[PDB]
Design a binder for this molecule. Structure first.
Ligand SMILES: Nc1ncnc2c1ncn2[C@@H]1O[C@H](COP(=O)(O)OP(=O)(O)CP(=O)(O)O)[C@@H](O)[C@H]1O
Lengths: 225, 204
């Protein structure tokens, strides 16, 4: 609200739209995460790889395990799916996730481990709800901890290039599939309460509204069918 | 070959005595039938420096001697007869002239009983007079090669030229829309290199 209000006072306009321009990088909302005790200890801080604890890796295991449903919430618009799995931009990289994977200090994955004691979820975009996003992330992360989820193998490669020579699950390709996944995810849906089902109803309707829009591209490519 | 008699018989009123310069430019002089006998024997004079021949404005004129066997009555204007010519300078063929240069290499090969024959696939675009865009705004698809619709949209022009080539005896056998939007190609039978070269110059 502040950014939009101030931009407007300067005769400008601000947008947090996920993919406002077709060939340019989109708006991420990269979210840095850690879990603390009331005594003030960072539970993610540890003696495992890259300075992370087993609690950290389990929380990550939950992010990975619930990634498909989590996409519905942190990538909540039709337009969101033009930022994810996007063709390479003019600057040489999209800097957004394509796959359900994690790396070290590596910005080509769904999750990046920037330093000891925290995770960066690179999945969310600028449309992500400031309250629903942390909520769904936490729900997933908690389930990971509770079940001691295995996040699998860290990939120290550029997913944009050296990603075709490896087995990695692809993120949902559109809002419809993301919402389908959220609805099938008992932990997320249950974790978010009645918000999840209501959210799913709205996003389904948005997708349907999107489908009904006739585009110039279809006309150019289909008029002569 | 008696060009003067042919002119009377075929109703040719003007001849284009033509040669190709180093840049492929077609240079021609338009001579009335009354003057053809003179040109056939003596050649047509041109200031060579004015074409891409790498000469000097101080040089004597070149003389383009027409090859009578190259005669083509313009199919779209039969009263004009086109002739390909060898550029001569100072009483002998001029080695800087393309046709002359080709005939020199052909003669060396022929001396060894090796005769070059070739055919050419001369792709071209049909575009607006101002050159800014192709002629058919409806020819837009990503893979337009052999597009039946766009091909037939230019049937009149393509069919006219193909039929000329039939009449000329070149043995045309296929006309295609090629891989670029607005692009086409019309094939005809290979022949002795010199024949194909003259046809190539005329075709364009
Ligand atoms: N022995 C030969 N020597 C030289 N040219 C020959 C030849 N035999 C055929 N040609 C010529 O080569 C040209 C192309 O022939 P052709 O159409 O058969 O080949 P291609 O099918 O690879 C052409 P495209 O891809 O456009 O269909 C024609 O002018 C043809 O006459």
């Amino acid at each position: 609200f502040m950014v939009k209000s101030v931009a407007e006072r300067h005769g400008l306009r601000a947008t947090f739209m996920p993919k406002p321009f077709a060939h340019l990088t989109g708006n991420g909302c990269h979210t840095h995460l850690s879990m603390w005790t009331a005594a003030g200890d960072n539970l993610f801080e540890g003696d495992g790889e890259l300075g992370l604890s087993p609690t950290a890796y389990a929380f990550l295991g939950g992010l990975i395990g619930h990634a498909k449903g989590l996409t519905a919430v942190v990538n909540p618009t039709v337009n969101s799916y033009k930022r994810l799995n996007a063709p390479v931009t003019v600057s040489g990289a999209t800097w957004s996730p394509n796959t359900i994977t994690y790396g070290g200090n590596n910005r080509t994955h769904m999750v990046r481990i920037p330093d000891a004691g925290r995770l960066e979820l690179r999945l969310p975009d600028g449309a992500a709800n400031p309250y629903l996003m942390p909520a769904a992330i936490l729900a997933a992360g908690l389930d990971g901890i509770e079940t001691q989820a295995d996040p699998g193998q860290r990939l120290d490669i550029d997913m944009y290039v050296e990603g075709h020579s490896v087995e990695a699950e692809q993120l949902p390709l559109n809002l419809l599939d993301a919402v389908r996944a959220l609805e099938a995810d008992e932990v997320l849906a249950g974790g978010l309460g009645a918000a999840a089902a209501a959210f799913a109803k709205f996003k389904r309707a948005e997708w349907a509204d999107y489908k009904s829009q006739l585009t110039e591209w279809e006309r150019r490519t289909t008029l002569d069918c | 070959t008696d060009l003067a008699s042919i002119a009377r018989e075929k109703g040719i009123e003007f001849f284009l005595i033509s040669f190709t310069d180093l840049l492929g430019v077609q240079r021609a002089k338009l001579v009335p039938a009354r003057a053809i006998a003179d040109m056939a024997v003596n050649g047509a004079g041109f200031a060579g420096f004015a074409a891409w021949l790498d000469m000097s404005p101080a040089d004597a004129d070149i003389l383009a001697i027409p090859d009578p066997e190259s005669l083509i009555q313009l199919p779209w204007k039969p009263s004009v007869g086109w002739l390909a010519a060898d550029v001569h300078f100072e009483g002998r063929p001029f080695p800087k002239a393309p046709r002359v240069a080709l005939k020199s290499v052909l003669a060396r090969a022929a001396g060894k009983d090796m005769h070059l024959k070739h055919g050419v696939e001369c792709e071209f675009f049909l575009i607006q007079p101002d050159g800014s865009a192709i002629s058919d705004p409806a020819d837009t698809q990503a893979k337009p090669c052999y597009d039946q619709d766009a091909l037939m949209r230019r049937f009149d022009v393509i069919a006219e030229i193909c039929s000329y080539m039939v009449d000329l005896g070149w043995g045309p056998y296929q006309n295609d829309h090629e891989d670029a939007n607005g692009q086409f190609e019309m094939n005809w039978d290979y022949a002795d290199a010199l024949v194909t070269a003259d046809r190539h110059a005329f075709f364009k």
